[PDB]
Write a protein that binds this DNA or RNA. Structure first.
Lengths: 144, 136, 175
RNA sequence: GGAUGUGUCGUCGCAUAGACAGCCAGGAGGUUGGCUUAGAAGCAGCCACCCUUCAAAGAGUGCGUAAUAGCUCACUGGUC
Protein backbone atom coordinates (compact mmCIF):
# COMPACT_ATOMS: atom_id res chain seq x y z
CA UNK A 1 0.00 0.00 0.00
CA UNK A 2 3.10 2.21 0.31
CA UNK A 3 6.92 2.40 0.42
CA UNK A 4 8.03 1.86 4.05
CA UNK A 5 10.50 -1.04 3.74
CA UNK A 6 11.42 -3.57 6.42
CA UNK A 7 13.76 -6.46 7.35
CA UNK A 8 11.62 -8.88 9.38
CA UNK A 9 12.88 -12.08 11.05
CA UNK A 10 10.50 -14.90 12.02
CA UNK A 11 10.02 -18.70 12.01
CA UNK A 12 7.34 -20.98 10.49
CA UNK A 13 6.66 -24.76 10.37
CA UNK A 14 7.69 -26.13 6.96
CA UNK A 15 4.93 -28.44 5.73
CA UNK A 16 1.79 -26.55 6.82
CA UNK A 17 -0.49 -23.81 5.44
CA UNK A 18 -0.42 -21.23 8.26
CA UNK A 19 -3.66 -19.67 9.64
CA UNK A 20 -4.19 -16.60 11.86
CA UNK A 21 -1.77 -17.44 14.70
CA UNK A 22 1.45 -17.63 12.59
CA UNK A 23 1.41 -15.19 9.62
CA UNK A 24 -1.85 -13.34 8.88
CA UNK A 25 -1.09 -9.80 10.20
CA UNK A 26 2.54 -10.37 11.35
CA UNK A 27 4.37 -9.62 8.08
CA UNK A 28 1.40 -8.98 5.79
CA UNK A 29 1.32 -5.55 7.44
CA UNK A 30 4.49 -4.28 5.73
CA UNK A 31 3.27 -5.05 2.19
CA UNK A 32 3.74 -8.50 0.63
CA UNK A 33 1.76 -11.26 -1.15
CA UNK A 34 0.44 -14.20 0.91
CA UNK A 35 -1.19 -15.98 -2.06
CA UNK A 36 2.24 -16.66 -3.62
CA UNK A 37 4.00 -17.78 -0.43
CA UNK A 38 1.58 -20.67 0.12
CA UNK A 39 2.73 -21.74 -3.36
CA UNK A 40 6.34 -20.55 -2.89
CA UNK A 41 7.76 -21.61 0.50
CA UNK A 42 5.35 -24.54 0.97
CA UNK A 43 6.86 -26.09 -2.17
CA UNK A 44 10.44 -25.99 -0.86
CA UNK A 45 9.33 -27.90 2.25
CA UNK A 46 9.02 -30.83 -0.14
CA UNK A 47 12.82 -30.56 -0.13
CA UNK A 48 13.64 -31.20 3.56
CA UNK A 49 10.54 -32.68 5.22
CA UNK A 50 9.09 -32.59 8.77
CA UNK A 51 10.70 -29.74 10.77
CA UNK A 52 10.50 -26.01 11.60
CA UNK A 53 12.88 -24.52 9.01
CA UNK A 54 13.51 -20.82 9.94
CA UNK A 55 12.69 -18.13 7.33
CA UNK A 56 13.82 -14.49 7.04
CA UNK A 57 11.54 -12.13 5.11
CA UNK A 58 12.55 -8.74 3.67
CA UNK A 59 9.79 -6.50 2.29
CA UNK A 60 10.51 -3.67 -0.17
CA UNK A 61 7.07 -2.16 -0.84
CA UNK A 62 4.00 -2.50 -3.10
CA UNK A 63 3.58 -6.26 -3.72
CA UNK A 64 7.25 -7.20 -3.25
CA UNK A 65 8.93 -9.70 -0.91
CA UNK A 66 12.18 -11.68 -0.76
CA UNK A 67 12.84 -14.58 1.65
CA UNK A 68 15.67 -16.87 2.81
CA UNK A 69 14.97 -20.47 3.91
CA UNK A 70 17.58 -21.87 6.33
CA UNK A 71 17.99 -25.23 8.10
CA UNK A 72 15.57 -27.60 9.91
CA UNK A 73 16.23 -27.77 13.67
CA UNK A 74 17.10 -31.43 14.31
CA UNK A 75 15.29 -31.09 17.63
CA UNK A 76 12.56 -32.88 15.67
CA UNK A 77 15.15 -35.59 14.85
CA UNK A 78 16.75 -35.82 18.34
CA UNK A 79 13.36 -36.25 20.00
CA UNK A 80 12.92 -38.76 17.17
CA UNK A 81 16.36 -40.16 18.07
CA UNK A 82 15.01 -41.40 21.42
CA UNK A 83 11.23 -41.67 21.78
CA UNK A 84 9.76 -38.49 23.27
CA UNK A 85 7.89 -36.13 20.94
CA UNK A 86 8.07 -33.35 23.53
CA UNK A 87 11.29 -32.33 25.28
CA UNK A 88 12.60 -33.33 28.70
CA UNK A 89 10.99 -31.71 31.76
CA UNK A 90 14.52 -30.75 32.80
CA UNK A 91 17.91 -31.30 31.07
CA UNK A 92 19.76 -32.32 34.28
CA UNK A 93 17.05 -34.22 36.22
CA UNK A 94 15.44 -36.33 33.43
CA UNK A 95 17.40 -37.04 30.23
CA UNK A 96 16.22 -38.13 26.76
CA UNK A 97 18.55 -40.33 24.68
CA UNK A 98 21.90 -40.27 22.83
CA UNK A 99 22.69 -39.41 19.18
CA UNK A 100 25.98 -40.03 17.36
CA UNK A 101 28.98 -38.06 16.09
CA UNK A 102 27.70 -39.00 12.60
CA UNK A 103 24.23 -37.55 13.22
CA UNK A 104 26.38 -34.49 13.84
CA UNK A 105 27.74 -34.74 10.28
CA UNK A 106 24.22 -33.97 8.97
CA UNK A 107 23.94 -31.05 11.38
CA UNK A 108 27.15 -29.36 10.24
CA UNK A 109 26.58 -30.12 6.54
CA UNK A 110 23.03 -28.81 6.22
CA UNK A 111 24.19 -25.92 8.45
CA UNK A 112 27.16 -24.92 6.28
CA UNK A 113 25.77 -21.49 5.38
CA UNK A 114 25.09 -21.25 9.14
CA UNK A 115 27.73 -21.80 11.85
CA UNK A 116 30.53 -19.35 11.04
CA UNK A 117 32.84 -21.93 12.64
CA UNK A 118 35.79 -23.44 10.80
CA UNK A 119 37.16 -26.94 11.33
CA UNK A 120 35.11 -30.10 11.95
CA UNK A 121 35.69 -30.05 15.72
CA UNK A 122 34.19 -26.55 16.02
CA UNK A 123 31.23 -27.21 13.69
CA UNK A 124 30.51 -30.44 15.63
CA UNK A 125 30.87 -29.19 19.21
CA UNK A 126 28.72 -26.08 18.47
CA UNK A 127 25.46 -28.05 17.99
CA UNK A 128 26.80 -30.64 20.39
CA UNK A 129 25.93 -27.69 22.65
CA UNK A 130 22.27 -27.47 21.48
CA UNK A 131 21.90 -31.13 22.52
CA UNK A 132 23.21 -30.35 26.01
CA UNK A 133 20.42 -28.31 27.63
CA UNK A 134 17.80 -30.05 25.48
CA UNK A 135 18.22 -32.98 27.86
CA UNK A 136 20.05 -35.71 25.90
CA UNK A 137 23.42 -37.33 26.77
CA UNK A 138 26.25 -37.40 24.20
CA UNK A 139 27.94 -40.44 22.63
CA UNK A 140 31.66 -39.76 22.50
CA UNK A 141 34.38 -37.27 23.34
CA UNK A 142 38.18 -37.71 23.34
CA UNK A 143 40.07 -41.00 23.95
CA UNK A 144 38.33 -44.40 23.46
CA UNK B 1 6.43 -21.21 68.58
CA UNK B 2 5.19 -22.69 71.90
CA UNK B 3 6.79 -24.95 74.47
CA UNK B 4 4.89 -28.21 75.08
CA UNK B 5 4.40 -28.59 78.91
CA UNK B 6 5.95 -26.47 81.74
CA UNK B 7 5.01 -24.53 84.97
CA UNK B 8 2.82 -21.52 83.73
CA UNK B 9 3.71 -17.88 84.76
CA UNK B 10 7.03 -15.84 85.14
CA UNK B 11 8.71 -12.37 85.48
CA UNK B 12 11.10 -9.78 83.95
CA UNK B 13 14.80 -8.38 84.29
CA UNK B 14 17.99 -7.63 82.06
CA UNK B 15 21.79 -7.50 81.25
CA UNK B 16 23.97 -8.52 78.18
CA UNK B 17 23.77 -11.92 76.31
CA UNK B 18 25.07 -15.13 77.86
CA UNK B 19 25.54 -17.58 75.04
CA UNK B 20 26.00 -17.40 72.34
CA UNK B 21 27.52 -14.59 70.38
CA UNK B 22 29.09 -16.94 67.85
CA UNK B 23 28.26 -18.30 64.43
CA UNK B 24 27.72 -22.08 64.36
CA UNK B 25 25.59 -24.20 61.93
CA UNK B 26 26.10 -21.71 59.12
CA UNK B 27 28.03 -19.23 57.02
CA UNK B 28 25.98 -16.04 57.58
CA UNK B 29 24.31 -14.86 60.77
CA UNK B 30 21.94 -12.27 62.18
CA UNK B 31 22.48 -10.70 65.55
CA UNK B 32 20.31 -8.64 67.96
CA UNK B 33 21.53 -5.20 69.07
CA UNK B 34 18.82 -4.39 71.60
CA UNK B 35 17.46 -6.01 74.85
CA UNK B 36 14.01 -6.95 73.47
CA UNK B 37 11.38 -9.56 74.10
CA UNK B 38 10.57 -11.60 71.02
CA UNK B 39 7.17 -13.19 70.38
CA UNK B 40 6.60 -16.45 68.50
CA UNK B 41 4.74 -14.83 65.60
CA UNK B 42 7.58 -12.32 65.18
CA UNK B 43 10.00 -15.15 64.60
CA UNK B 44 7.33 -17.05 62.64
CA UNK B 45 7.23 -13.92 60.52
CA UNK B 46 11.01 -13.88 60.00
CA UNK B 47 11.01 -17.61 59.29
CA UNK B 48 8.34 -17.23 56.61
CA UNK B 49 9.98 -14.18 55.09
CA UNK B 50 13.40 -15.81 54.76
CA UNK B 51 11.93 -19.23 53.79
CA UNK B 52 10.09 -17.62 50.91
CA UNK B 53 13.06 -15.50 49.75
CA UNK B 54 15.39 -18.51 49.71
CA UNK B 55 12.68 -20.47 47.88
CA UNK B 56 13.75 -24.08 47.91
CA UNK B 57 15.83 -24.62 49.78
CA UNK B 58 18.82 -22.98 51.49
CA UNK B 59 19.33 -23.74 55.18
CA UNK B 60 17.72 -21.85 58.06
CA UNK B 61 18.71 -22.03 61.72
CA UNK B 62 16.31 -20.28 64.05
CA UNK B 63 18.49 -20.16 67.13
CA UNK B 64 16.19 -18.20 69.45
CA UNK B 65 13.19 -19.82 71.07
CA UNK B 66 10.18 -18.50 73.15
CA UNK B 67 10.02 -20.29 76.48
CA UNK B 68 8.77 -17.26 78.44
CA UNK B 69 5.04 -16.93 79.18
CA UNK B 70 3.67 -13.34 79.16
CA UNK B 71 0.25 -12.64 80.52
CA UNK B 72 -2.30 -9.87 80.14
CA UNK B 73 -5.27 -9.29 82.37
CA UNK B 74 -8.82 -9.55 80.85
CA UNK B 75 -10.44 -6.54 79.21
CA UNK B 76 -11.58 -3.83 81.66
CA UNK B 77 -10.80 -5.34 85.04
CA UNK B 78 -9.78 -3.52 88.17
CA UNK B 79 -6.28 -4.63 89.28
CA UNK B 80 -5.95 -7.71 91.51
CA UNK B 81 -8.32 -10.72 91.68
CA UNK B 82 -5.36 -12.62 90.17
CA UNK B 83 -2.51 -12.78 87.73
CA UNK B 84 -3.27 -12.43 84.04
CA UNK B 85 -3.60 -15.62 82.07
CA UNK B 86 -0.91 -16.35 79.46
CA UNK B 87 -1.52 -14.04 76.54
CA UNK B 88 1.46 -15.15 74.50
CA UNK B 89 5.15 -16.32 74.46
CA UNK B 90 8.37 -14.36 74.28
CA UNK B 91 12.09 -15.23 74.00
CA UNK B 92 14.26 -12.87 75.97
CA UNK B 93 16.89 -12.11 73.25
CA UNK B 94 19.68 -9.96 74.90
CA UNK B 95 22.10 -7.86 72.82
CA UNK B 96 24.78 -9.59 70.77
CA UNK B 97 22.88 -12.88 70.87
CA UNK B 98 22.67 -14.51 67.44
CA UNK B 99 19.06 -14.93 66.40
CA UNK B 100 19.55 -16.35 62.93
CA UNK B 101 21.83 -18.55 60.89
CA UNK B 102 21.52 -19.09 57.18
CA UNK B 103 23.78 -20.94 54.84
CA UNK B 104 23.71 -22.56 51.44
CA UNK B 105 23.01 -19.19 49.89
CA UNK B 106 25.20 -16.46 48.41
CA UNK B 107 26.27 -13.33 50.31
CA UNK B 108 23.68 -11.32 48.36
CA UNK B 109 20.84 -13.72 49.14
CA UNK B 110 21.90 -13.72 52.80
CA UNK B 111 21.96 -9.89 52.99
CA UNK B 112 18.52 -9.58 51.48
CA UNK B 113 16.76 -12.42 53.39
CA UNK B 114 18.24 -10.84 56.48
CA UNK B 115 17.09 -7.27 55.72
CA UNK B 116 13.63 -8.50 54.96
CA UNK B 117 13.60 -10.35 58.31
CA UNK B 118 14.94 -7.23 60.03
CA UNK B 119 12.12 -4.95 58.97
CA UNK B 120 9.78 -7.49 60.65
CA UNK B 121 11.73 -7.18 63.92
CA UNK B 122 11.17 -5.14 67.15
CA UNK B 123 14.84 -4.20 67.29
CA UNK B 124 17.88 -3.12 65.32
CA UNK B 125 20.13 -5.91 64.03
CA UNK B 126 23.42 -6.65 62.29
CA UNK B 127 24.51 -9.48 59.95
CA UNK B 128 28.00 -11.03 60.18
CA UNK B 129 30.07 -14.06 58.98
CA UNK B 130 32.00 -16.71 61.04
CA UNK B 131 35.59 -16.53 62.57
CA UNK B 132 34.02 -16.83 66.04
CA UNK B 133 35.76 -20.08 66.98
CA UNK B 134 35.45 -19.75 70.72
CA UNK B 135 34.53 -23.38 70.17
CA UNK B 136 33.01 -25.72 67.59
CA UNK C 1 53.94 -8.38 65.40
CA UNK C 2 55.58 -6.13 68.02
CA UNK C 3 53.77 -5.51 71.33
CA UNK C 4 55.45 -3.47 74.06
CA UNK C 5 54.29 -3.20 77.67
CA UNK C 6 52.44 -5.63 79.90
CA UNK C 7 51.45 -4.18 83.24
CA UNK C 8 48.25 -5.29 84.99
CA UNK C 9 47.02 -1.74 84.12
CA UNK C 10 45.22 -1.14 80.77
CA UNK C 11 44.75 2.68 80.57
CA UNK C 12 48.13 2.91 78.76
CA UNK C 13 46.65 1.41 75.58
CA UNK C 14 42.85 0.92 75.80
CA UNK C 15 41.58 3.49 73.27
CA UNK C 16 44.90 3.48 71.37
CA UNK C 17 43.65 0.29 69.67
CA UNK C 18 45.58 -2.50 71.40
CA UNK C 19 44.49 -5.91 72.65
CA UNK C 20 45.30 -7.33 76.06
CA UNK C 21 47.07 -10.65 75.68
CA UNK C 22 49.02 -13.45 77.33
CA UNK C 23 51.54 -15.85 75.82
CA UNK C 24 52.63 -18.80 77.90
CA UNK C 25 55.63 -21.10 77.32
CA UNK C 26 54.29 -23.64 79.89
CA UNK C 27 57.47 -22.83 81.80
CA UNK C 28 57.74 -19.14 80.92
CA UNK C 29 54.56 -16.92 81.17
CA UNK C 30 54.19 -13.37 79.83
CA UNK C 31 51.36 -10.81 79.76
CA UNK C 32 51.38 -7.97 77.17
CA UNK C 33 49.48 -5.86 74.61
CA UNK C 34 49.47 -5.91 70.77
CA UNK C 35 48.37 -3.31 68.18
CA UNK C 36 44.82 -4.30 67.20
CA UNK C 37 45.19 -3.47 63.47
CA UNK C 38 48.19 -5.79 63.32
CA UNK C 39 46.64 -8.81 65.10
CA UNK C 40 43.57 -8.28 62.95
CA UNK C 41 45.46 -8.54 59.67
CA UNK C 42 47.33 -11.40 61.31
CA UNK C 43 44.63 -13.56 62.91
CA UNK C 44 42.61 -13.11 59.76
CA UNK C 45 45.55 -14.46 57.74
CA UNK C 46 46.78 -17.29 59.96
CA UNK C 47 43.78 -18.15 62.22
CA UNK C 48 44.01 -20.64 65.15
CA UNK C 49 46.62 -22.82 63.41
CA UNK C 50 48.54 -19.58 62.92
CA UNK C 51 52.23 -19.52 63.92
CA UNK C 52 53.82 -16.07 63.92
CA UNK C 53 56.81 -14.30 65.49
CA UNK C 54 56.51 -12.15 68.61
CA UNK C 55 59.25 -9.65 69.57
CA UNK C 56 58.63 -8.01 72.97
CA UNK C 57 59.92 -4.42 73.35
CA UNK C 58 63.08 -5.76 75.02
CA UNK C 59 64.79 -7.63 72.18
CA UNK C 60 63.68 -11.25 72.71
CA UNK C 61 61.59 -12.68 69.84
CA UNK C 62 59.65 -15.95 70.19
CA UNK C 63 57.35 -17.94 67.83
CA UNK C 64 53.73 -18.69 68.86
CA UNK C 65 50.25 -20.01 68.03
CA UNK C 66 46.70 -18.76 68.89
CA UNK C 67 44.95 -20.75 71.66
CA UNK C 68 41.84 -18.66 72.42
CA UNK C 69 40.22 -15.31 71.62
CA UNK C 70 37.90 -13.26 73.82
CA UNK C 71 35.34 -10.91 72.31
CA UNK C 72 33.09 -7.98 73.12
CA UNK C 73 29.67 -9.57 72.67
CA UNK C 74 28.00 -6.26 71.79
CA UNK C 75 30.76 -4.67 69.69
CA UNK C 76 31.85 -7.99 68.19
CA UNK C 77 35.53 -7.27 68.39
CA UNK C 78 38.66 -8.60 70.19
CA UNK C 79 39.36 -7.40 73.73
CA UNK C 80 41.69 -10.22 74.92
CA UNK C 81 43.85 -13.10 73.56
CA UNK C 82 45.18 -16.45 74.84
CA UNK C 83 48.50 -17.24 73.12
CA UNK C 84 50.36 -20.59 73.07
CA UNK C 85 54.17 -20.25 72.97
CA UNK C 86 55.01 -23.03 70.50
CA UNK C 87 57.53 -25.78 71.28
CA UNK C 88 59.34 -27.58 68.44
CA UNK C 89 58.67 -31.26 67.79
CA UNK C 90 55.34 -31.94 69.46
CA UNK C 91 52.80 -29.10 70.09
CA UNK C 92 49.17 -29.48 71.11
CA UNK C 93 45.98 -30.38 69.24
CA UNK C 94 45.05 -28.24 66.26
CA UNK C 95 41.52 -27.23 65.21
CA UNK C 96 41.38 -26.88 61.42
CA UNK C 97 38.63 -25.95 58.92
CA UNK C 98 36.97 -28.60 56.79
CA UNK C 99 36.53 -27.27 53.28
CA UNK C 100 34.89 -28.66 50.17
CA UNK C 101 36.03 -28.92 46.56
CA UNK C 102 34.50 -29.40 43.13
CA UNK C 103 30.88 -29.34 42.04
CA UNK C 104 29.35 -32.16 44.08
CA UNK C 105 26.88 -34.46 42.38
CA UNK C 106 24.49 -33.55 45.15
CA UNK C 107 23.82 -29.95 44.16
CA UNK C 108 22.92 -31.15 40.68
CA UNK C 109 19.94 -33.40 41.40
CA UNK C 110 18.37 -31.81 44.47
CA UNK C 111 20.36 -30.95 47.56
CA UNK C 112 23.33 -29.03 48.91
CA UNK C 113 26.75 -29.33 50.56
CA UNK C 114 26.42 -28.89 54.34
CA UNK C 115 29.62 -28.82 56.46
CA UNK C 116 27.93 -30.38 59.52
CA UNK C 117 31.08 -29.63 61.59
CA UNK C 118 33.01 -26.57 60.38
CA UNK C 119 36.05 -27.13 62.57
CA UNK C 120 37.87 -30.44 63.08
CA UNK C 121 40.29 -30.79 65.96
CA UNK C 122 43.15 -33.18 65.24
CA UNK C 123 45.95 -34.42 67.46
CA UNK C 124 49.44 -33.26 66.45
CA UNK C 125 51.46 -32.81 63.25
CA UNK C 126 54.95 -31.95 64.39
CA UNK C 127 54.74 -28.12 64.85
CA UNK C 128 56.57 -26.16 62.15
CA UNK C 129 54.29 -27.91 59.70
CA UNK C 130 50.63 -27.55 60.70
CA UNK C 131 47.81 -28.23 58.27
CA UNK C 132 46.08 -24.85 57.90
CA UNK C 133 43.11 -26.08 55.86
CA UNK C 134 41.74 -29.56 55.05
CA UNK C 135 40.23 -30.27 51.58
CA UNK C 136 37.56 -33.00 51.33
CA UNK C 137 36.32 -34.23 47.95
CA UNK C 138 32.56 -34.27 47.54
CA UNK C 139 32.09 -34.92 43.80
CA UNK C 140 31.32 -38.60 44.50
CA UNK C 141 28.73 -37.60 47.07
CA UNK C 142 25.02 -37.98 46.39
CA UNK C 143 22.01 -36.83 48.41
CA UNK C 144 21.76 -38.80 51.65
CA UNK C 145 25.51 -39.33 51.81
CA UNK C 146 27.34 -38.70 55.12
CA UNK C 147 31.15 -38.30 55.39
CA UNK C 148 32.40 -39.75 58.73
CA UNK C 149 35.51 -38.29 60.41
CA UNK C 150 37.52 -41.37 59.46
CA UNK C 151 37.57 -40.87 55.69
CA UNK C 152 39.53 -37.59 55.95
CA UNK C 153 43.02 -37.69 54.38
CA UNK C 154 45.47 -36.57 57.08
CA UNK C 155 48.91 -35.31 55.91
CA UNK C 156 51.22 -37.90 57.63
CA UNK C 157 52.13 -37.71 61.33
CA UNK C 158 48.57 -36.54 62.05
CA UNK C 159 45.89 -38.38 64.03
CA UNK C 160 42.24 -37.73 64.90
CA UNK C 161 40.94 -36.39 68.22
CA UNK C 162 37.51 -36.78 66.61
CA UNK C 163 35.37 -39.87 67.07
CA UNK C 164 35.95 -40.95 63.48
CA UNK C 165 32.42 -42.19 62.76
CA UNK C 166 31.01 -38.73 63.55
CA UNK C 167 29.16 -37.00 60.74
CA UNK C 168 31.08 -34.22 58.98
CA UNK C 169 30.52 -32.61 55.53
CA UNK C 170 27.15 -34.15 54.60
CA UNK C 171 24.92 -33.33 51.62
CA UNK C 172 21.28 -32.55 52.46
CA UNK C 173 18.02 -33.04 50.45
CA UNK C 174 15.97 -30.04 49.25
CA UNK C 175 12.93 -28.27 50.84
C1' G D 1 12.37 3.57 58.71
C1' G D 2 14.93 6.72 55.42
C1' A D 3 18.98 10.32 53.26
C1' U D 4 25.82 11.88 47.26
C1' G D 5 24.31 16.90 54.69
C1' U D 6 29.07 17.71 56.97
C1' G D 7 33.50 16.44 60.10
C1' U D 8 36.69 11.97 61.58
C1' C D 9 38.67 7.06 61.36
C1' G D 10 38.91 1.97 59.03
C1' U D 11 37.99 -1.79 55.17
C1' C D 12 38.05 -3.13 50.20
C1' G D 13 38.32 -2.06 44.86
C1' C D 14 39.85 -0.02 40.45
C1' A D 15 43.48 2.73 37.99
C1' U D 16 51.04 5.53 34.16
C1' A D 17 48.60 -2.44 31.02
C1' G D 18 45.05 4.67 30.61
C1' A D 19 40.38 3.65 34.73
C1' C D 20 35.23 6.12 37.41
C1' A D 21 31.93 10.01 34.37
C1' G D 22 31.30 11.99 29.36
C1' C D 23 31.26 10.74 23.85
C1' C D 24 31.43 7.22 18.83
C1' A D 25 30.39 1.85 17.66
C1' G D 26 29.62 -3.32 18.11
C1' G D 27 26.73 -5.76 20.83
C1' A D 28 26.92 -11.24 18.58
C1' G D 29 25.73 -17.67 15.06
C1' G D 30 23.81 -21.87 16.96
C1' U D 31 18.84 -20.56 19.47
C1' U D 32 11.85 -19.36 19.53
C1' G D 33 17.83 -23.46 24.74
C1' G D 34 14.46 -27.15 27.24
C1' C D 35 10.13 -27.28 30.03
C1' U D 36 4.98 -24.72 30.35
C1' U D 37 1.69 -22.61 26.95
C1' A D 38 -4.05 -20.32 23.45
C1' G D 39 1.01 -18.06 22.12
C1' A D 40 6.12 -17.18 26.15
C1' A D 41 10.96 -16.58 21.33
C1' G D 42 16.68 -12.60 27.44
C1' C D 43 12.18 -10.66 29.87
C1' A D 44 4.06 -14.68 33.58
C1' G D 45 6.05 -19.81 36.16
C1' C D 46 10.17 -25.23 36.69
C1' C D 47 15.92 -27.24 35.40
C1' A D 48 21.13 -25.69 33.29
C1' C D 49 24.25 -21.65 32.60
C1' C D 50 27.52 -25.19 26.69
C1' C D 51 30.02 -23.90 21.82
C1' U D 52 31.14 -20.51 17.55
C1' U D 53 33.82 -15.73 15.75
C1' C D 54 37.18 -12.07 18.16
C1' A D 55 40.64 -6.54 20.44
C1' A D 56 34.95 -7.38 22.63
C1' A D 57 30.02 -9.27 22.77
C1' G D 58 26.91 -12.98 28.96
C1' A D 59 20.41 -18.93 27.42
C1' G D 60 21.95 -11.97 29.43
C1' U D 61 19.62 -6.18 33.08
C1' G D 62 15.09 -2.73 32.74
C1' C D 63 11.36 -0.77 29.71
C1' G D 64 8.41 -3.27 25.72
C1' U D 65 4.48 -7.08 22.95
C1' A D 66 -1.57 -10.77 23.74
C1' A D 67 3.60 -13.25 21.77
C1' U D 68 7.30 -10.93 17.76
C1' A D 69 9.85 -7.10 16.45
C1' G D 70 11.87 -2.78 19.08
C1' C D 71 15.27 0.73 23.29
C1' U D 72 19.59 -0.36 26.59
C1' C D 73 22.86 -2.28 29.69
C1' A D 74 27.28 -6.50 31.71
C1' C D 75 32.46 -6.84 27.82
C1' U D 76 35.93 -4.42 24.34
C1' G D 77 38.20 -0.40 21.09
C1' G D 78 38.95 4.63 20.22
C1' U D 79 38.65 9.31 22.98
C1' C D 80 40.84 11.58 26.70
Amino acid sequence: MRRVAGIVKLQLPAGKATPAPPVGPALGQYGANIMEFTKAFNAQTADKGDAIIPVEITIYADRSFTFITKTPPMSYLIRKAAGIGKGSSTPNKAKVGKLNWDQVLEIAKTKMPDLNAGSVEAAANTVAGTARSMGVTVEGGPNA
Amino acid sequence: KRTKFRKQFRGRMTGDAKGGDYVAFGDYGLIAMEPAWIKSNQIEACRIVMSRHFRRGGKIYIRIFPDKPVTKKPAETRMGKGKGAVEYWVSVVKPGRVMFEVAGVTEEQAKEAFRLAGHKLPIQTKMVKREVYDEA
Amino acid sequence: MELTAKPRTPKQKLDESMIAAVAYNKENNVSFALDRKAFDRAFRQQSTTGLFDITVEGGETFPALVKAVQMDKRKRAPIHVDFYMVTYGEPVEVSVPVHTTGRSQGEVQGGLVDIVVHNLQIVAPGPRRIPQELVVDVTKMNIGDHITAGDIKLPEGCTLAADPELTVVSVLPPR
